[PDB]
Structures are given as structure tokens and as C-alpha cells.
Symmetry: D2
Subunit: 325 residues, 4 copies
């Protein structure tokens, strides 16, 4: 009796197709279904009983919070069933920073939720998709993968949704977390778990979007030399509920950024100072406005802020989420 795994497809280059096998970038992309991905890897039949389901068919650069609501609700419906042991989600790499972390806070089950992607299309020479999908299903079918939070599997690595991000624009090994490493690795058709996420996730999370139809809008504004104050004005004008600041260094604000953040806060907008660096802690500073993002990236900080605004508008409670989640 093999485990029962459901593969939910949302699109991405993993389900992409090009005219030539030498083409990995800059091509008229064609989408493939979940059944085509399953049929491409007949070795999945030794791991688990597989059922395919197409949630979406878009590039992750076009992934929206509305589709994330639909995805999370469907994952929760499936994991509540006794005939589903785990869920594998085929997704694009461009916003694989956000999607798994969204599910890390919204999934109400200990059963494995494994995001999977590919940097090369299925038609490409040495396409990474087939092995990544094999690894993802293997992880989801393993009972030892439970209670570890949402997992992300690419290039023989098992990364945490809380730390893993696309660190390189175009390489196969792009998904890394320099300061936190990987939760596990897949070597020689065997899973080796090494670390556990020391943050609040899945079953112990207070965030629930089961009865949420629309999430609060949150913008991300970059921090740099000569950064305009008018970007904050644009966010205020359109009435966003939150703003994540991709700050210079440890979330440092310029005179124009400081003025823009305080103007947003006076209108009731919750601002969180993250970092454009790529990793590390943004420490508390009473001399600067806004909350701090802890070690959360601008992309993941936005996700947490959106979900935090569904529960509260209290800055201290939201700050507590950033240090715990």
C-alpha cells in the first residue's frame, strides 16, 4: 500500500515548452498540464499513488493573492481527507519566495505540502523538472516529512518556506538560504533530514484564510540612493493597508524614505522595514519609523503583513508575528 499524493499544478517553467532544446531563456512559452508532467516521470508510480489537479496555468510572475487564496483553501480541503497523505505543488520559480511562505502560514495540517519548480523547460537539455518532481513526490510520500512546515524541493534540496529564496536569476542551484541552509537533502534516492524550522508554522499558526475572499493590499518600495518620496504617495493614494520597505542595509531609511513612511503611518498604513541585502536581521530601532522584518525578505514580509492585517492593525501584535513567524 503506497501513499496517496495529490499534485496541484499552477504553471511555471516546470510545465513550459520551447521550440528548441537549447532554448532555456527568451522563448515563446507553451504550457503543459499536470498529467503531462506525471506521464513524463513514470518512476513516480514506485513512490506513491498519484492524482493530478490543475489549479492554475500561469507563470509565477503573474501569481496573485487571489489564486493563493484558492490554492490554500484547496490544500486544506485535500489534507483534511483521510485518502490524501501529502500535496505536491508545481509552481514557477519567479515568485516561489512568496507562495510557499503563504501556505506555511495558512495550511492547517501537519501533512507535507511540497512546492516544486524547474529552472529549465521540459524540452530543454538536462531539464531539471523531472528529477525535482520525483524528489518532491518522494518527500510528500515520506511520513518523516510531517510537521516541518511547507517544503520547497529543487536541485536535490529540501528548503523551508520561511527561509528559501531564488538567490540567482538563472541557475539550477538558485534556491538557497545562506544563513539557514536546508531542512534536508535528497541523495541516492534517500531523504536526509538535518534541520528543523524554529518558527511558528502550519498547525500552530493563527492565520486562517478559509473565510477570506480578498486580502489587504500591500506594496513593496525599494530603498536606494535618491529614492523618491512620491512612491509612498502613490501607495497612500491607492489606499494600501501595508507597505514593506526593501531597505538599504539593515532597513535604513533616507530622509525621503523616512518622510514617506511617516506619512503612510499617519494615514493608518502599517509599514515594515525589510532589507534589500538578501539575508540577515533588521534590528529594532526607535530612531526610525515602521516595524522591523526580523530576517524576513521583502517578498516574504509582504506575505506575512497581508495575513497579519486580516487579524489586527495593532503594530505591536504585528511586530510579534515578525519575530515568531
Amino acid at each position: 500500500n503506497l501513499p496517496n499524493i495529490v499534485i496541484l499544478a499552477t504553471g511555471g517553467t516546470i510545465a513550459g515548452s520551447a521550440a528548441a532544446n537549447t532554448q532555456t531563456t527568451g522563448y515563446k512559452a507553451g504550457a503543459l498540464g499536470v498529467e503531462t508532467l506525471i506521464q513524463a516521470v513514470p518512476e513516480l508510480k514506485t513512490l506513491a499513488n498519484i492524482k493530478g489537479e490543475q489549479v492554475a496555468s500561469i507563470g509565477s510572475e503573474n501569481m496573485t493573492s487571489d489564486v493563493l487564496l484558492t490554492l490554500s483553501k484547496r490544500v486544506n480541503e485535500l489534507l483534511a481527507r483521510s485518502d490524501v497523505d501529502g500535496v505536491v505543488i508545481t509552481h514557477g520559480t519567479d515568485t516561489l519566495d512568496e507562495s510557499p511562505y503563504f501556505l506555511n502560514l495558512t495550511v492547517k495540517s501537519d501533512k507535507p505540502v511540497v512546492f516544486v519548480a524547474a529552472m529549465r523547460p521540459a524540452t530543454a537539455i538536462s531539464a531539471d523538472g523531472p528529477m525535482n518532481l520525483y524528489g518532491a513526490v518522494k518527500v510528500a510520500a515520506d511520513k518523516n516529512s510531517r510537521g516541518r512546515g511547507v517544503l520547497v524541493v529543487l536541485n536535490d534540496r529540501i528548503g523551508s518556506a520561511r527561509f528559501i529564496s531564488k538567490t540567482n536569476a538563472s541557475t539550477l542551484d538558485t534556491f538557497k538560504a545562506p544563513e539557514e541552509g536546508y531542512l534536508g537533502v535528497i541523495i541516492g534516492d534517500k531523504i536526509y533530514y538535518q534541520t528543523r524550522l524554529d518558527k511558528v508554522h502550519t498547525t500552530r499558526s493563527v492565520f486562517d484564510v478559509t473565510n477570506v475572499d480578498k486580502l489587504p493590499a500591500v506594496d513593496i518600495i525599494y530603498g536606494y540612493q535618491d529614492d523618491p518620496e512620491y512612491m509612498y504617495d502613490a501607495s497612500i493614494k491607492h489606499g494600501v493597508k501595508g507597505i514593506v520597505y526593501a531597505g538599504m542595509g539593515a532597513g535604513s531609511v533616507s530622509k525621503r524614505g523616512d518622510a514617506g513612511i511617516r506619512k503612510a503611518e499617519s494615514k493608518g498604513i502599517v509599514v515594515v522595514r525589510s532589507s534589500r541585502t538578501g539575508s540577515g536581521i533588521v534590528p529594532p530601532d526607535a530612531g526610525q519609523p515602521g516595524l522591523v522584518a526580523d530576517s524576513l525578505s521583502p517578498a516574504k514580509s509582504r506575505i506575512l503583513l497581508m495575513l497579519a492585517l486580516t487579524k489586527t492593525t495593532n503594530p505591536a501584535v504585528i511586530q510579534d508575528y515578525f519575530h515568531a513567524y
Copy 2:
């Protein structure tokens, strides 16, 4: 006789002072003069004859293109003299991604221009400033450091202005370049050069800002899920000459980002697609609008685009600069 090195001060945590040494973050920053930094390390006298100038006294988060013009003009004025062998620039870490790369394209000399910074204030326990400054002066005083482009010295490393960036928000070893490494290292009071910059820099650069009073305005717009098109509308309204897109993955645009970029291009604004990932190549794509940033980060792409706009607005010529510089 010893070489003649001039230390130009712009500010930063390297010249920062706190009431307690346990404080490294969120403190009352006390700005120190260039002479105080020189007197703190009397071992600089064994390396070279030191002179100090105070170009600026601000945090790098407030570093502007106007101050960079003043800095670049002063560096070129000093390096043209026979009594100056090299220059050391004490700067902050928050925008040390931009400043050195600016001078990497504007300095008209093979003489060493070495940027130096510190993550911990001078008062802090195990302050990195003193050793960083010693290493920077040592690098600038070495004649073998010539013709290598603008250098950045922190944590015993010599990084290229073209590749090095603050990769972590709060650590001493934050300045890294995972795909390109370091040009050299400083170990045991000795310099070990290992790699050379294979890009156009300094003397061979066509970018000259000697007769430039004001640089063209360039904004950076971040790429993420549900990214607003109105950010581009804000840039267009304020009449920016360039827009750098910190794209999802390999500079991928959403439907709103695509619309915002094409709207900017119709107004004559040159848009360059960079990446929010942290490293890697953004490959050319005819299916997407805007130019491609090659391996240049959003911060450095903005610097190059700003300087490219002083000479031309032609997309093909600017694209050529992005692959060469």
C-alpha cells in the same frame, strides 16, 4: 620613501560613535572626523604618508548623486597630481553597492581608489573599522593594486566595485559576490590578488562627469506578486529619465509591470530589467519590454543607467554598456 595616500571621508558607521560598546544597532550616531579615524590607527604611518579630507559627513543611506559628483571630481583632481599615489574613501555600508561602482565608471586613473566601511561603530566591542581602514590603506599604497578598477575593502577582502554588495543586513562578512568572488584577500599583513575584473572600468571607461552638474533621475521599481502599475505612473509623472526594474527571477514582468514599462518606454524613458534575486544573469528576451541588466544588481544598474543617460538615450547603445561595464 612611503607612498602618498589621501583619505576622503563621507561618513558612515566607520565614523560612528555610541555611548555603549554593546550597541551596534539602533543608537545615537556620533559623527567622527577624518583626522580622528587616522589617529585611531597609528599603524597607517608604516604604510604611507596620510592626508585627510572631509568630503561629506552623512550616513550612506542619505548618499546622493550630487555628493557622488563632488566625490568623483575630487578623486580625479587628486589622482591627476604626482603627489598622490592612491585614495581611500571611508563610506557607509548601506549604499556601498552604488558609490564604488559610480567611481568605477567615472575615475580617469589607474591609481587605486579603495572604498572602506565598517559594520560596527568605532566604540563597539571588536569594532571592524580599524582593521578595515588598515587593510584599505595597505591596498591603496600597493602599486600592484593599480589598473584593477575601484576596490572595496572590508573583513580582509578586496572586492570589485562591479560585483561586491552588502548581502547581509547586519553581519561583518556581509560584502560578498557568490558568483564572482573577491579580486584579492588581505591575510597576515600581506595582499594576495587572485582575480581580475574582466569588464571595462576606470581609464578605459567612456563615462565622464567632470562637466556634469546634475545627473538624470532614475527610479527602481520592485517586482513581486500583485505589483502595482501605478508605481510606473508615478515615475512617468515626475519625468525620470530611467527606470530600473528589480524583477522577479530573471527580470520577469507581470502583466501590470509589462504595461508600466511599455508606458514608460513610449515616453522616452529607458527601462532596464534587473533582478531581485541577488545574483545572476538577466538574459535578453524579445518577448519582454525593456533592456536587460546582465549580471548587474538593481542598485548598480541604476548607477550605470544614470551615467549612460548623460551620453545617450539609445536602447541598443545602453544595452551594449550593460554587457561591457
Copy 3:
């Protein structure tokens, strides 16, 4: 009432002194007592009630298994007392791969055992010792640091004794674990735990050396092109109980290395195939002799094998230790 922390000194460059402050390497090293290190950082009094003890005064390159036995028995006696909350151990960096992992398997307490070291002597410019010691004591005094296994603190990082190793010969940031990251970080006088060790350690470990006078001899033989078979003959002649093979790639043996290992196994010597690469999994292979080291480095594999030989010689039980510890 502040926690009671005991600082045990074994030596190292953290307690080293040079002729000049520009000397970090190649000098006549002097020794500093445990009290000299404590008085150098008066900020330790705000963290905990400190009591220093001098266990040894040697370079870690000369650290032996006999001294580790004495250290482990002493730590166990200290932590068994109700008036001790944690222990900080000043040690050298050269064999900081072995020592903490030894205590990770032998210390029977949830109370923090924090190893600390320095890459620069206390006399050097921007000596890392003072801050590393401050960070180590802060970790040991924190109640949240309990039950996390043996910790290693340098350069604002909290690494696991199971994963952390000296990855660079001479840099301050040398202690890394690319595949596993850090358990926590120390930023802005605050501790941020991110991951937990998912292996058997400390309290749950079966390795008890309280009644052990002398440990079994284990050698490490390197794997390379034209590697001699006579090195294995030298180990067999001296009657070692174990041999760790620092293998090429994934612990691959040459024809001479295969012959040497099989000859050792016939004499009752338990051989474990590790890797010279620096990281990763050495997978099981029925076509090759010896056991596999999992992700354990040659240095750490020797430590585990040495402790495993005090309990059993059964290859199946020892292999189970390598996948669980």
C-alpha cells in the same frame, strides 16, 4: 539574579598575544589566562555571574582525546550542579571541528555548552575575541538556548557542533555550514534562533564516557590520485580500532584505497568512508568496502567512530549511529 556561567579555558588564539597589533599570523605566541579574557570584556557582568577556570593552555592543533575526556567529565559535573546554568569553553579554531562535536555526544545536560574562539589574537587590531566571548556568554546565559545541543559562537553566529566547521584557513567568518546554515544569530545585542538540530544529541545520546579512561585510536587517511596503500598498513600495524577515509568525491575509493580498507576490515578495524569535499552526503554503496559517514566530515566522523567503538564493534550499529547522530 543573573544566571551563573562557568568559563572553561583550553587555550587558542583567543587567549593569544603577538609582538605587534598588525600581527595576526606568524608570530611568537604568548598565553593569556581565563581571568585576563574576562576582565578584557567588563560587559560580561551585565549578562551573567562569571566564574573562570583554566582547564588547559594549548593550541587546538595539539588538543588530544585524553584532554577531551577530562573536559567532558568536567562539563558533566559542572552542569549537574543546581548553581550552574551554562558553560562557555574558550578553544582554538584549528580543531574546533572535533571538540564541540565530542561534547555534543557526551554531555548529558540540556544546559548550554557554548564553544568560543577567535581568529585574531587579543592584541591584534579589531580582535574578534572580545565580541565572540560576549556573544558566547550571552548565548549560555539565555534560557532559550537550552536543549539545542553543543553550540559554537564566532562572528555573531551560533552554529551546531554537528554541522559547523572551519571552512577557511584565515578569515573571521570561517565557521560556516553551507548545507545546514546556523542555528541562530546574534544581532543588536539580541539572540535570534532560526533552526534546530534534527539529530540525536546531548541528553538523548547513548555515548557515555564517564567510566572511560582511554579512547580507541582512530586515524584519518586522505583520498587522492596515486594514494598509497601503505598508509593503511601503518594504521593496521599500530592496532587502531577505527579508520576514517577522507574520500575523493562521495567517499570513492581507488584500487589502492579499496585494498587498504579491505585489509583493515579483515583485521577487525571498522572503516568509515567520509569525504574530502567539505560537505554533502556519502551514500551507501554495496560495491565499496567500509561504512558511510552520511554528512559527517572526516574530523567529526573520527569523533563519532571513536565514541562508537567504546560501546560496540558491530558495523550495523555503528552505521545506525552515523545516520542518527
Copy 4:
């Protein structure tokens, strides 16, 4: 017309064939000829005119100095011809630390010598071989690859033979150089060179093996706690010409290692102190015996020492080679 590239096969997992595609490790390895590798990638015909030769059919773990001597002589006579523009060498990954660096010092031409390997067998799911081979041939056929030293191409990276090493036992992205990065990358069917090797290589190298029948024997002895002195006695007994010490930290010797090295030096054996860390500089120290390996790893130090012993035994001259090569 297209360039003329010769592919020299030595063996390895790139030419490996397993029973099942889920088998990447621990399998009965099969041997695939050079023509089988060429016919597997028909896209090589668009890059260059290909001719294949079978130099060897062994795993790199069994690669010997006599085969490297034969390989180097064959590469040199091929590059001397006008009908050969570059050479691609299919090799194993286990000793890809040594082989390319050997040729980096022995090749007497600016024509590209590109080593290529694969972590997964040709039969495996998402086998890296085909893309790596395509990338290697593309690099060898590119005129811009000339005068850059021996290149190593895997996972879309172009690494220098001087710096690149297998850093992980079992992953696709194993070939890294933390402190030096890559010379270039292959993204979207385009080569992007970023750094150049700032060491003496190929054409300018003084190490000629045209008239060498047998290379001097050089052993590598590992440095660790309780390291035996008898390993050095075994090397002296068999009359090796050199000994590379894989030292603890920055090549630090124990009391037994110090006694063993000085005993080797008294018998005329040249000893070089390298590091077991994985990267970094081993600094000169008059207080310790033996020469220093600079930034060279134990594997690469052995290669340089072996080639230096064909010319001289003078300690100061060999030490100079270690800082220049």
C-alpha cells in the same frame, strides 16, 4: 566555418550507465565510449566540428599521474596543430580538483582546454551530462575563451582550474570556489565572462612535462587531533619526493606533525603545509617547518609540488611557485 574541437575521453560518471534511472549513486557502473557521448547531444554540430578520442576508460578516483602525463602530452600535440582550435576533456568529478590544475601548469597553448564532468549518470533522471558537455564544447569553440587557463564546466559555470573544487560529495552544483567565484557563466545559450585568473598559467607556465617519463611521488597526510607521526615515517620509508600536509586551520602542525615534517625535511623531502578547511590562505610562519600552500588545496598543492620537483628541490624557489601559480 565552425571551429575544430577534439573531445578526449578519460571516463567518469558522465560516461556512466546504470540499470535504473533512479540510480544516481551506489550502482554497477557501465562504460560509454566518446562517440556515445557525442551522438547523445546532436546539438554539438551547431557549435563545432567534433572529433573524439578515448584516452582512458576509468573512474577519476583511479586517475593516476602516468595517465595525466599521457593526457598532457596528447593535449599539447593536438593544440600545436593548426586544425585544432580547442580541446574538451570528459573526466570524472572525484579528482577533478587535480586533473585540470595539472594541465593548467603543463599546457603550452592559449587554446581552450575545457574539462567537463557529470554528477549524475547518462541514464539518470535529469542527467547533467548532456548540458555540461554542450556548455564545455561551446566554451572551447568560443574565441573569447582563449588565454584564460584551463577551464572546468559544470552546472552552467566556467571555473578556473586554479580555484574550482568539488565542495559537496553528491550535488549537481558541487563545483564552487567560495573566495574566487567563477571566471564566467553560461546563461541562455550565451557565455558571460566576468573574472580572469591572476596567476601564472598555461603558456607562461615553466612546468614542461614533454620530457618527463615518470612524475615524483607525493603523499598527502591529513591534520587532526591525535594525528600519528608514523604516517610521515611511512612516506619516508617509501622514498617520496614531496609531502603535502592537509593542516588543521591555517596549516597548523601538532607536536607529532611537527616532528614528522622535520624528519621528512632531514631526508630531503620537500613538505608543503596546506589546509583541510576548504579555502583560504596558509600564511608564512618561521615558527613552523615546511613551505606554505598559499590558497592551494591539499589536492592542488600536491599537483604543483609534484611538477615543481621535476625542476628543482630548492625550498625558496618552490615557495615562490606556490605564490605565483
